[PDB]
Structure 1
Amino acid sequence: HWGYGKHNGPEHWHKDFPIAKGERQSPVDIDTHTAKYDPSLKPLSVSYDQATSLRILNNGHAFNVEFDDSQDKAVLKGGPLDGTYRLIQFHFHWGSLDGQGSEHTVDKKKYAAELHLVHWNTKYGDFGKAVQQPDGLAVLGIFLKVGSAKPGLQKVVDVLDSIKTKGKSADFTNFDPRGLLPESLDYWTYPGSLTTPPLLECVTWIVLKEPISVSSEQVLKFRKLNFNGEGEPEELMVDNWRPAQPLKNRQIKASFK
């Protein structure tokens, strides 16, 4: 029964998921004055030309756009990574107001939203085995600010009405996740965790420096989603973000000078 309410939000998660107070929790604040350039880092390789989206699902905490991860169709390589990581889904976290919504922060700045493209390390065979490994997942995080519309997001926005409430899914084929990327692939990276229960410490985070812009109308449609199921009391799906967690014994590395 975890969520983002008064009685079940992030500050409560540790009771059911004690790793919430662990050594490698996410998100974190990215201090651009202490992150150090690492010349050993490589460019990211984002290979999404063969990506096969299948479906979009309201899971009660966000919505997931799901992909075919049964072949190396949409993969992330390079950067800080060893090996090949397959795209399984993306989702967002967003606010009730444009001044909050992101999970990571940059010099304490909160963005309006944050996109997570979730990938699992093919050496572990399946997502469920991957999340049990410290190097099981690679999550590409991308900040959203409100300004111009993002045309490559509109197909997602337009399906939201069909998945308003928890448990609803809809076919969602032929969606191109390349339309969600900024121009630059400059990034920060550090070791961390899932940002929702079970909060497993299995993620190499790759957070892009450059935000994408979405329009105020686009974000407004996200805020019409519901956390509840159909026929239950309406509770708007907003503020579905975990705040920054202590960095502890970690360093954030930058791909760029």
Structure 2
Amino acid sequence: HWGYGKHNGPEHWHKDFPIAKGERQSPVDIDTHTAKYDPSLKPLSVSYDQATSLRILNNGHAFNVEFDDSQDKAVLKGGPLDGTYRLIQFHFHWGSLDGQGSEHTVDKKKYAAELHLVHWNTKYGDFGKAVQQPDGLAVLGIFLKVGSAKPGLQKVVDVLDSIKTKGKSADFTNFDPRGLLPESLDYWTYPGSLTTPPLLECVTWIVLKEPISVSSEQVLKFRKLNFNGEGEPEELMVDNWRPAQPLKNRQIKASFK
């Protein structure tokens, strides 16, 4: 159905998902000179000590590392958020070359990739209910630039050969997502949407200012994945990012001066 090619990519999504042209779509460009410091914003609380990763899945658009979200084990709170949001999965968006790949941009700069740690508001009971609410999800976004290797990413990189094609999964227990964070939790925040269909306007976005560095070899392995299923013509999983969407009547707030 939808995808990232010329015939089914982001410019086509509105025909099946008319919210694609909505009032709070993501991603957006973060204009750093226009984002206002909000001293009312609290420090983020990232509590991943008890995270329970389970499985890694190639879903035909990215790969997801899935977590046990049946209890409050890995949660995001504070910052702009009211209440408690449970980690359900993380995934990335990346490019065919290092000069593109991120979904959010910073003063129009594109990073090589972007990590999304996806959390749902426990007041709605399950993820499917949460996505129907304007405050249902919180996605923590982290930019990736190419330079030195990220040691905490290597366990992900090394399993990708086992999930090359759409629909393949592999056991992925005991992975610590704290190894994917940068040092600083300074962030920008704004109300937005899922960046893939169904594009629901249910996300509080929290985008960290500090990128993580990954090595060229690490991102090259991302680019060896396939959008296609096994025994189908090979289409490399690259450029699985949606471009920036109109900001409309929204303000991006900064946690830092």
Q: TM-score range by the shorter chain?
A: over 0.9
Name the SS of the counterpart of 1:155 in structure 2.
helix
Query: Offset at 1:214?
Result: 0.1
- What is the CA deviation profile of residues 21-76 of structure 1, one whole-angstrom value per residue up to 9, with x for unaligned ones? 00000000000000000000000000000000000000000000000000000000
- What is the CA deviation profile of residues 98-132 of structure 1, one whole-angstrom value per residue up to 9, with x for unaligned ones? 00000000000000000000000000000000000
Inter-partner Cα distance in structure 1 for 2:82 and 2:6: 40
Inter-partner Cα distance in structure 1 for 2:76 and 2:63: 22
Corresponding position of 2:183: 183
Inter-partner Cα distance in structure 2 for 1:177 and 1:6: 34
Q: Runs of 4 or more off by more than 3 Å in structure 1? A: none
Inter-partner Cα distance in structure 1 for 2:102 and 2:6: 19
- What is the CA deviation profile of residues 78-107 of structure 1, one whole-angstrom value per residue up to 9, with x for unaligned ones? 000000000000000000000000000000
Corresponding position of 2:44: 44
Name the SS of the counterpart of 1:239 in structure 2.
coil
Residues 1-257 of structure 1 aligned to structure 2 (within 5 Å): 1-257=1-257
Name the SS of the counterpart of 2:120 in structure 1.
strand
Gaps of 5+ in 2: none
Query: Offset at 1:228?
Result: 0.1
Gaps of 5+ in 1: none
Query: Offset at 1:248?
Result: 0.1
Name the SS of the counterpart of 1:73 in structure 2.
coil
Name the SS of the counterpart of 1:14 in structure 2.
helix
TM-score (norm 2): 1.00
Name the SS of the counterpart of 1:111 in structure 2.
coil
Inter-partner Cα distance in structure 2 for 1:169 and 1:124: 28
- What is the CA deviation profile of residues 197-248 of structure 1, one whole-angstrom value per residue up to 9, with x for unaligned ones? 0000000000000000000000000000000000000000000000000000
Query: Offset at 1:77?
Result: 0.2
Inter-partner Cα distance in structure 1 for 2:189 and 2:38: 10
Inter-partner Cα distance in structure 1 for 2:47 and 2:145: 25
Name the SS of the counterpart of 1:234 in structure 2.
coil
Inter-partner Cα distance in structure 2 for 1:184 and 1:224: 31
Inter-partner Cα distance in structure 2 for 1:143 and 1:210: 7
Inter-partner Cα distance in structure 2 for 1:62 and 1:18: 23
Query: Offset at 1:251?
Result: 0.1
Inter-partner Cα distance in structure 2 for 1:189 and 1:163: 33
TM-score (norm 1): 1.00
Inter-partner Cα distance in structure 2 for 1:145 and 1:238: 16
- What is the CA deviation profile of residues 146-188 of structure 1, one whole-angstrom value per residue up to 9, with x for unaligned ones? 0000000000000000000000000000000000000000000
Inter-partner Cα distance in structure 1 for 2:18 and 2:6: 19
Inter-partner Cα distance in structure 1 for 2:68 and 2:43: 25
